[PDB]
Amino acid sequence: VQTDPPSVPICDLYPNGVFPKGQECEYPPTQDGRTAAWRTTSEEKKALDQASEEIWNDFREAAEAHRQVRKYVMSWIKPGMTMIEICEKLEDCSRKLIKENGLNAGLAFPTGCSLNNCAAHYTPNAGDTTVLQYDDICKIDFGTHISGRIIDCAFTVTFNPKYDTLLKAVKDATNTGIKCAGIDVRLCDVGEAIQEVMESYEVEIDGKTYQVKPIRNLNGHSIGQYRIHAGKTVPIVKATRMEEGEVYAIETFGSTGKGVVHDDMECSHYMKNFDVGHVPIRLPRTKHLLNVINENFGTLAFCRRWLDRLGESKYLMALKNLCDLGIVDPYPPLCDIKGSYTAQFEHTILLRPTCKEVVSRG
Numbered sequence: 001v002q003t004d005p006p007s008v009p010i011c012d013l014y015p016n017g018v019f020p021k022g023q024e025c026e027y028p029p030t031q032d033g034r035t036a037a038w039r040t041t042s043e044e045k046k047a048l049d050q051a052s053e054e055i056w057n058d059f060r061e062a063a064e065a066h067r068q069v070r071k072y073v074m075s076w077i078k079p080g081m082t083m084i085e086i087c088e089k090l091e092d093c094s095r096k097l098i099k100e101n102g103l104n105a106g107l108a109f110p111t112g113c114s115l116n117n118c119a120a121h122y123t124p125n126a127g128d129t130t131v132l133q134y135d136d137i138c139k140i141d142f143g144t145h146i147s148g149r150i151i152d153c154a155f156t157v158t159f160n161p162k163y164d165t166l167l168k169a170v171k172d173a174t175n176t177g178i179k180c181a182g183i184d185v186r187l188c189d190v191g192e193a194i195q196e197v198m199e200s201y202e203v204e205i206d207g208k209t210y211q212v213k214p215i216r217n218l219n220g221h222s223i224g225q226y227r228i229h230a231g232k233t234v235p236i237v238k239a240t241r242m243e244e245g246e247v248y249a250i251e252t253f254g255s256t257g258k259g260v261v262h263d264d265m266e267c268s269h270y271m272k273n274f275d276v277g278h279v280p281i282r283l284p285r286t287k288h289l290l291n292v293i294n295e296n297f298g299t300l301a302f303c304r305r306w307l308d309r310l311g312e313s314k315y316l317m318a319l320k321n322l323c324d325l326g327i328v329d330p331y332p333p334l335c336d337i338k339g340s341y342t343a344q345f346e347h348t349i350l351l352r353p354t355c356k357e358v359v360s361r362g
């Protein structure tokens with residue numbers, strides 16, 4: 001049985017090695033009104049689904065770790081805590097439950113804890129004294145993986161009820177996206193549906209009214225093995241189609257600002273360019289850092305805190321060299337206008353030959 005606080009790896013909770021399935025859904029009907037129900041009983045679709053059972057089983061193990069971590073996070077996340085303490089407590093639990101084992105099992109990307117106007121990609125670097133406030137709107141975005149089968153799942157934390165309708169707008173837009181997604185469904189269609197739902201909401205925060213705006217340059221995406229973004233984008237504002245066997249992160253962002261984000265603040269997130277092959281490096285500090293990245297993260301994203309934890313120091317020039325060489329890409333915090341409020345909800349979905357599985361669903 002799982003301990004309180006959670007410390008038992010998901011692997012040990014399921015001795016048979018069969019991890020729980022997420023929410024299973026029938027695919028949406030076509031424009032003509034033809035149902036996709038036939039996929040569930042098709043012997044050909046069942047054969048194709050069984051052939052990838054090991055892959056879905058890995059996503060399910062990573063999803064169960066994610067559910068247990070986020071249930072744990074919700075029980076203690078409070079204003080007064082430093083952003084570092086929140087991230088380290090969350091990551092310590094995540095490492096234990098995923099049974100972190102080099103590139104075979106672990107953390108898919110750093111824990112995002114972006115606040116207020118900053119929509120995404122903010123994690124504290126060493127020495128960050130930021131403390132979570134009662135009026136903050138915090139986006140907890142973390143990932144787990146088994147054999148590079150990534151769970152990309154996020155939720156928004158608040159303490160003040162004044163943001164309740166903003167959170168509801170974004171949860172409804174995310175659930176709409178999940179519902180509209182399916183094999184042969186256009187990505188532009190999922191995007192238009194998300195926008196229509198989010199914009200139907202009006203909110204009042206400290207005597208000011210706003211229509212909830214989707215963040216036009218933040219989007220959902222396909223997921224590849226050891227690849228957080230596999231090249232297909234799911235817009236969240238108003239003709240490429242989703243394909244069978246694909247995995248998607250369905251995420252939406254709502255804002256009281258412009259509904260557009262720009263790079264801002266100190267960068268904490270970094271990730272090797274997936275398309276860049278072998279690059280010989282002679283520069284000793286740059287060479288060492290790339291070897292550290294290749295061994296510990298490969299093509300998965302990382303943060304400066306994780307380099308500090310690995311015992312690395314005086315690596316900032318080496319890291320900048322890797323960025324300038326195009327081997328590593330920086331992913332700085334993405335912010336809307338000062339004074340604005342942003343919220344996010346995200347799930348990982350499997351486009352299985354038989355059904356659509358919201359593998360990360362709570």
Ligand SMILES: CC(C)Oc1cc(N2CCNCC2)ccc1-c1c(C(N)=O)[nH]c2cc(F)c(F)cc12
Binds near residue numbers: 110152229
């Ligand atoms: C800027 C955007 C929000 O995130 C991305 C854009 C890309 N793109 C490449 C192809 N060219 C366009 C950009 C790749 C990956 C991401 C990305 C995502 C995500 N999409 O959820 N989560 C992350 C976490 C990380 F720690 C990280 F380092 C990167 C990411």
Ligand SMILES: [Mn+2]
Binds near residue numbers: 141142152153154346
């Ligand atoms: Mn995410």
Ligand SMILES: [Mn+2]
Binds near residue numbers: 152221249346
């Ligand atoms: Mn994502």
